[PDB]
Design an enzyme around this catalytic site. Structure first.
Site, PDB file in Angstrom:
ATOM      1  N   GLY A   1       0.803  -1.204   0.000  1.00  8.82           N
ATOM      2  CA  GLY A   1       0.000   0.000   0.000  1.00  8.82           C
ATOM      3  C   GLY A   1       0.838   1.255   0.000  1.00  8.82           C
TER       4      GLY A   1
ATOM      5  N   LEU B   1      -1.522   6.607   4.631  1.00  8.85           N
ATOM      6  CA  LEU B   1      -0.873   6.067   5.819  1.00  8.85           C
ATOM      7  C   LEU B   1       0.602   5.801   5.560  1.00  8.85           C
ATOM      8  CD1 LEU B   1      -1.053   4.982   8.690  1.00  8.85           C
ATOM      9  CD2 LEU B   1      -1.391   2.727   7.627  1.00  8.85           C
TER      10      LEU B   1
ATOM     11  N   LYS C   1       2.714   7.136   3.271  1.00  5.35           N
ATOM     12  CA  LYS C   1       3.614   8.247   2.988  1.00  5.35           C
ATOM     13  C   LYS C   1       3.705   9.223   4.149  1.00  5.35           C
ATOM     14  CE  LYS C   1       0.199  10.473  -0.039  1.00  5.35           C
ATOM     15  NZ  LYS C   1      -0.532  11.758   0.204  1.00  5.35           N
TER      16      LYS C   1
ATOM     17  N   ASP D   1      -2.173  -1.396  17.673  1.00  9.95           N
ATOM     18  CA  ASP D   1      -2.954  -0.293  18.225  1.00  9.95           C
ATOM     19  C   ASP D   1      -1.927   0.785  18.558  1.00  9.95           C
ATOM     20  OD1 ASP D   1      -4.195   1.492  20.188  1.00  9.95           O
ATOM     21  OD2 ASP D   1      -5.814  -0.012  20.341  1.00  9.95           O
ATOM     22  N   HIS D   2      -1.965   1.915  17.842  1.00  8.74           N
ATOM     23  CA  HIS D   2      -0.816   2.821  17.927  1.00  8.74           C
ATOM     24  C   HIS D   2      -0.684   3.487  19.296  1.00  8.74           C
ATOM     25  CE1 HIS D   2      -3.671   6.167  17.112  1.00  8.74           C
ATOM     26  NE2 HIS D   2      -2.720   6.953  17.594  1.00  8.74           N
ATOM     27  N   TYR D   3      -1.736   3.488  20.121  1.00 10.55           N
ATOM     28  CA  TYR D   3      -1.586   4.009  21.481  1.00 10.55           C
ATOM     29  C   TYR D   3      -0.505   3.268  22.260  1.00 10.55           C
ATOM     30  CZ  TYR D   3      -5.222   7.523  21.817  1.00 10.55           C
ATOM     31  OH  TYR D   3      -5.963   8.680  21.697  1.00 10.55           O
TER      32      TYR D   3
ATOM     33  N   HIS E   1      -8.155   1.833  21.556  1.00  9.35           N
ATOM     34  CA  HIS E   1      -7.177   2.647  22.282  1.00  9.35           C
ATOM     35  C   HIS E   1      -7.475   2.716  23.774  1.00  9.35           C
ATOM     36  CE1 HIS E   1      -5.949   3.520  18.334  1.00  9.35           C
ATOM     37  NE2 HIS E   1      -6.760   4.535  18.097  1.00  9.35           N
TER      38      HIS E   1
ATOM     39  N   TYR F   1       0.490  14.112  37.711  1.00  9.36           N
ATOM     40  CA  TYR F   1       0.148  15.031  38.791  1.00  9.36           C
ATOM     41  C   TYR F   1      -0.442  14.249  39.953  1.00  9.36           C
ATOM     42  CZ  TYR F   1       0.247  18.126  34.749  1.00  9.36           C
ATOM     43  OH  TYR F   1       0.632  18.797  33.610  1.00  9.36           O
TER      44      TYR F   1
ATOM     45  N   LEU G   1       5.090  16.239  38.169  1.00  7.90           N
ATOM     46  CA  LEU G   1       6.166  15.470  37.565  1.00  7.90           C
ATOM     47  C   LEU G   1       6.083  15.669  36.054  1.00  7.90           C
ATOM     48  CD1 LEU G   1       5.824  14.367  40.442  1.00  7.90           C
ATOM     49  CD2 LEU G   1       6.197  12.125  39.503  1.00  7.90           C
TER      50      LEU G   1
HETATM   51  O1  LIG Z   1      -4.677  10.576  19.619  1.00  2.00           O
HETATM   52  P1  LIG Z   1      -4.100  10.241  18.256  1.00  2.00           P
HETATM   53  O2  LIG Z   1      -2.736   9.560  18.365  1.00  2.00           O
HETATM   54  O3  LIG Z   1      -3.945  11.447  17.369  1.00  2.00           O
HETATM   55  O4  LIG Z   1      -5.271   9.253  17.616  1.00  2.00           O
HETATM   56  C1  LIG Z   1      -6.603   9.732  17.591  1.00  2.00           C
HETATM   57  C2  LIG Z   1      -7.276   9.153  16.377  1.00  2.00           C
HETATM   58  O5  LIG Z   1      -7.148   7.684  16.506  1.00  2.00           O
HETATM   59  C3  LIG Z   1      -7.819   6.927  15.399  1.00  2.00           C
HETATM   60  O6  LIG Z   1      -7.669   5.593  15.679  1.00  2.00           O
HETATM   61  C4  LIG Z   1      -9.280   7.367  15.309  1.00  2.00           C
HETATM   62  O7  LIG Z   1      -9.965   6.691  14.245  1.00  2.00           O
HETATM   63  C5  LIG Z   1      -9.395   8.840  15.119  1.00  2.00           C
HETATM   64  O8  LIG Z   1     -10.793   9.238  15.097  1.00  2.00           O
HETATM   65  C6  LIG Z   1      -8.737   9.581  16.237  1.00  2.00           C
HETATM   66  O9  LIG Z   1      -8.839  10.987  15.975  1.00  2.00           O
END
Ligand SMILES: O=P(O)(O)OC[C@H]1O[C@@H](O)[C@H](O)[C@@H](O)[C@@H]1O
Length: 484
Positions: free
Chosen positions: A15, A20, A22, A182-184, A245, A379, A400
């Protein structure tokens, strides 16, 4: 104890022409390279259907590479681009993969490679995962090397769709080769949570129903869905950030301590606490949709030309949770997420119990706030005697602020941290298949109820407001004690 990928690793980004790829994947690969964490012998290959050149790809992504040293490290930019190349082909058919198999084996021979190390980043929607995964498994899989594939959420929109995807995925790639993002889980402050609580008696001794009144995970964004309302309509805020998330964060705050150092011990404890969640009470809910600002300056969710006017789409939700185990029994937990509120913020708030009677109880509850974003901080609301003759309590906020230490270190972006972890083979920050299954078993009944015919109508709240009506009451109903 998993094999680390260093020299002569080939990273293929499927892709590669998409947004996503680039704006995030390639910029993350560069950041790792720019700071010396991507080996220069790494072959980076972008694959997509369109028919672009090595020049097109490099010039497409260059506007998004980050130069924190300004015009300095500009040799690194050109250095990195020179490692990037492009191959065109369909995802649907074996000729592209066989052509790719040739480019890669050519490179893995020009460097004496006895064990191919291959990372496949699948910057694609799930409807194309399964095709590409099939093709990689049919055409580009060596039982004498190691291959890893990264896919990113969503993996389904309810239990049934997620099960179906995994049914197709499991015979192709095992949990050991799969890296579900999950990028969080790549955010700096999310990664500190386990050591913060388990490594400090001052928190761990209190981290239980005997001392915690209230747990809150909080997500606020100030913008809405304008332009994309029609897409969001079938998603909703719960699916968008709460099922994934926010649930991930909550899982890190409530799990028990991993008993070994294996990454799968982290994941076992996340799955374990997920299974202890009681079913969501469909009444213990606060559901909202954003209307026009009091201003008049901001449109309602329905003003979007791509949204039907009868839409019941939830853009704000607060949900109560209960975990039925020894640590958490009876502690009310709230997750709350909204778009088109007054600020952008992701935050954890934990309120501790007070003793009911005695000398040092005429005093506010201790409280712990962990800001994940924007300004990474911790905090603590504390109590202390007023200095001097006075013998009264005053409450003290301990700061902190992590900006102290971060102006000294390199703090990677989520995708930089996560790709690194994949290269090192560490599954700690990636979703496992049972983790996915249990999280969908938990949320699907709520989602079926809201989106069915008897689905409640979200209460309307003005764009930009602090909180929909009923929120402060909802929180006080879930054990939060408000104070001066
Ligand atoms: O808080 P971050 O890292 O910018 O991610 C928030 C975004 O995460 C995505 O997974 C959601 O689909 C978006 O709606 C959201 O805005």
């Amino acid at each position: 104890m998993a094999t680390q990928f260093d020299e002569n690793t080939v990273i293929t980004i499927f892709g590669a022409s998409g947004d996503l790829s680039k704006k995030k994947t390639f910029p993350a690969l560069f950041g790792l390279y720019r700071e010396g964490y991507l080996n220069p012998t790494t072959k980076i290959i972008g694959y997509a259907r369109s028919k672009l050149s090595n020049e097109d790809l490099r010039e497409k992504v260059k506007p998004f590479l980050k130069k924190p040293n300004g015009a300095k490290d500009d040799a690194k930019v050109n250095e990195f681009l020179s490692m990037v190349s492009y191959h065109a082909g369909p995802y649907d058919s074996d000729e592209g993969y066989l052509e790719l198999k040739k480019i890669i084996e050519e490179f893995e021979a020009e460097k004496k490679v006895d064990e191919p190390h291959r990372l496949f980043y699948l910057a694609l929607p799930p409807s194309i995962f399964i095709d590409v995964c099939s093709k990689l498994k049919e055409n580009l899989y060596t039982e004498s090397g190691i291959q890893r594939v990264i896919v990113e959420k969503p993996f389904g929109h309810d239990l049934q769709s997620a099960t179906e995807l995994q049914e197709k995925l499991a015979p192709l790639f095992s949990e050991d080769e799969l890296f579900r993002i999950d990028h969080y889980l790549g955010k700096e402050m999310v990664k500190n949570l386990l050591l913060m609580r388990f490594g400090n008696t001052f928190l761990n001794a209190a981290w239980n129903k005997e001392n915690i009144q209230s747990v809150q995970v909080v997500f606020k964004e100030p913008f809405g869905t304008e332009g994309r309302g029609g897409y969001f309509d079938s998603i909703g805020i719960i699916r968008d950030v709460m099922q994934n998330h926010l649930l991930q964060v909550l899982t890190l705050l409530t799990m028990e301590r991993p008993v070994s150092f294996d990454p799968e011990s982290v994941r076992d404890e996340k799955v374990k606490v997920l299974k202890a969640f009681s079913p969501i009470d469909h009444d213990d809910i606060l559901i909202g949709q954003y209307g026009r600002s009091v201003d008049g300056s901001k449109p309602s969710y329905l003003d979007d030309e791509t949204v039907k006017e009868d839409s019941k789409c939830v853009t704000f939700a607060a949900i109560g949770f209960k975990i039925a185990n020894e640590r958490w029994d009876g502690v009310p937990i709230v997750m709350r997420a909204g778009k088109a509120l007054n600020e952008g913020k992701v935050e954890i708030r934990i309120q501790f119990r007070r003793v009911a009677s005695g000398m040092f109880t005429d005093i506010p509850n201790n409280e712990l706030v962990i800001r994940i974003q924007p300004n990474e901080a911790i905090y603590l609301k504390c109590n202390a005697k007023t200095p001097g003759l006075a013998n009264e309590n005053q409450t003290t906020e301990l700061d902190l602020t992590y900006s102290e230490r971060y102006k000294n270190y390199w703090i990677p972006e989520a995708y930089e941290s996560l790709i690194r972890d994949a290269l090192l083979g560490d599954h700690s920050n990636f979703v496992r298949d049972d983790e996915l299954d249990v999280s969908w078993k938990l949320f699907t009944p709520l989602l079926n109820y809201l989106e069915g015919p008897d689905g409640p109508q979200p209460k309307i709240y003005p764009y930009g407001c602090r909180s929909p009506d009923g929120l402060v009451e909802f929180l006080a109903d879930h054990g939060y004690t408000f104070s001066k």
